[PDB]
Amino acid sequence: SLNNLQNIIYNPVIPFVGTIPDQLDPGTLIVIRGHVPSDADRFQVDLQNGSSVKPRADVAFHFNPRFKRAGCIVCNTLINEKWGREEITYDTPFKREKSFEIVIMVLKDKFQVAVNGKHTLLYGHRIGPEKIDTLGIYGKVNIHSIGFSFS
Template sequence: MAAVYGPAEVKVSKEIYDRATLEVLVQPKVGLPSVRERSQEQCLRESCEAALLLSLHPRSSLSLVLQVLHDDGSLLSCLLNAACMALMDAGLPMSRLFCGVSCAIGADGRILTDPTAAQEKIKVNGEEFFLFPHRLPVEQVRALQISGDVQVQTINVIGSVPYSSLIPGGMYPKRTVIIRGMLPYGAEKMAVNFVVSRSKDIAFHMNPRLREGAVVRNSRVGGRWGQEDRELGSSPFMEGQYFDMSIRCGNQRFKVFVNGQHLLDFFHRVPLAEIDRLEVDGDVQISYVHF
């Protein structure tokens, strides 16, 4: 819960002649504020001062008070978002908006967003979770740079569908592609395509159709679709359900596993070495892709 007070009169000892003085107070759920709350207050103050047009209210005071009602993890990002919304609701002039997101590295090395209190305590190589509030509009970010004495094995950038990514090193026997996501309520279909970029051929097209309870498989070579495969006992893809799909590449076929269970095989119709792109589209929310 967040509340904003002011602009109001300020004590002479805290008066700043060319802008307003901003005070931030974080109250824990129980007990008195500690070092943790003081650190949170500093982060909040710096973020708010960067966004507020304090020069419009010289020699005055603004107070931002945040009361923690529940803490199940990702508290600092919650405080940042509550502070921004409170400032907006108060009608204070701002040059920009800000928000925060917490990240944690899971036991399997994956990055988790908005971790729970239990996930925040997970350590990988002795390091705990980290948080970095946005300092500029996130939509302006256009590139990722990694430098230093490090060997990067894989980078996964997951956004909205349609998803399209080159497959580093292409496809080869014993390679596995992992796709995790959720089919929201109202979803009708999704598609996973292994593509040859040069010719736009689709070497393997997998199309779960939720209304039909079917998983259609096919390929498109030279602009023409091949023989469609539909035979399947039952489909594991359901509305409102998460899925964990592994697509394993063999010498003769793809083997698809969903939620740890073998689902289907699809024999190669295009030379394996030509496949270099993965595409995912349809009514699906992707959370993880790994090559």
């Protein structure tokens, strides 16, 4: 069949805030396909505990490609409305006016992220992934599809 993923969302409006329909147990995949517009300075994928804006939902994993100068990906965590220490990845595959596929795999102690079929970064858990029930996608990005593979 054409469906290889679960709970697929097509062509969402950005900003997108959606409930993740099952638990992010080890081996679970979040697959996001899209493209970067020509004027993009940044976009982000936020794995959140809820969708509240007061207090702002904890962001277990903020995955934030940035496009100025040489480009990078910034990752961080928001706990009780405060950012932690940034982790910057300098070898970034994202480019303005290009399409991409992000695959986030949840492991026991970290996330692993591949982009366009290549391992890109790790991010150690700072909030237990059991607290994550919401997917936010924000900023200057066009999303074609979101899908899941729940373990």
